[PDB]
Amino acid sequence: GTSKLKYVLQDARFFLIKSNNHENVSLAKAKGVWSTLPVNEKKLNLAFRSARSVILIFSVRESGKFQGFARLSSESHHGGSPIHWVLPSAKMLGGVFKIDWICRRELPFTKSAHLTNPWNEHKPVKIGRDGQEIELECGTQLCLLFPPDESIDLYQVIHKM
C-alpha cells in the first residue's frame, strides 16, 4: 500500500541530493549514511529540527534517474568509522547523517517531467544543485511516483517521528 508512505511524507521537507557516482549511493544504501558539504550539512541540520520528516531524494549525476529516497534519522555527527566514499578529500565533507531508506528503487527522469519545483524557478524537479530544497507538494508527488519498494517496512520509521 501507500498509506504509511503518505503518513511519513505528511508535512515533510524534501531535498535533492546529487551524487557524482553510483558507488556513494550504493554505500549509502548499504550502511544507511550520507555525508555532504558543510553548506548543505547546515541546511539539513536546521531542517531536521524543523519538520516531522526530512527526505533526501538521490540522483547520480548523468544517470538520468533518481536512485531512491530516504529519511534523516539524526542530525550530522562526527567521529564514526570512516566511510570510504569515492571523492573527486574526506576532510572536506561535514558530519555523517544516519538515514532510513524508504525506497531503494529507481525512477527515470522521463517519469517526473510533469513535476516542477517552485523553489527552483519551477524548473523540472530533476533540475537542481546538490541540496536544492523541493517544495512539499512537488516532493510528495515525486516520492509517490517511485515504484513501491516491498522490501521496506515503514512501521519502524513511523515510530521515529
Which chain residues interact with ligand 7RT by CB under 6 A?
Answer: 19-20, 24, 35-37, 85, 87-88, 130
User: Which residues touch 84 (CB under 8 Å, ≥6 apart)?
Assistant: 27
**Which residues are annotated binding-site positions?**
18-20, 34-35, 85, 130
Q: How far is the CB of 37 from ligand 7RT (least distance, A)?
A: 4
Cell numbers standing for residue 73: 534519522
Q: If we measure between CA atoms, which residue out of 99, 98, 100, 97 comes closest to residue 151?
A: 100
The secondary structure of 117-139 as a DSSP string is: EGGGTTEETT---TT-EE-HHHH
Q: In this complex, which beta carbon is closest to ligand 7RT, that of residue 18 or of residue 52? A: 18
For residue 87, the minimal CB distance to ligand 7RT (Å) is: 5
Q: CB 42 → ligand 7RT: shortest distance, Å?
A: 13
Q: Is residue 6 classed as helix, strand or coil in its secondary structure? A: helix
Instruction: State the distance between the two ends of the chain, measured CA to CA, in whole angstroms.
Output: 20
**Closest C-alpha to 123, from 16, 46, 20:** 16
Nearest distance from C-beta of residue 40 to ligand 7RT, angstroms? 7
In whole angstroms, what is the distance from residue 84 CA to residue 24 CA?
9
Select 3 or 89, whichever has its Cβ closest to ligand 7RT.
Answer: 89
- Indicate the residue among 8 and 17 with the shorter CB distance to ligand 7RT: 17
Annotated binding-site residues for RNA read 18-20, 34-35, 85, 130
Q: Which CB sits closer to ligand 7RT, 61 or 122?
A: 61
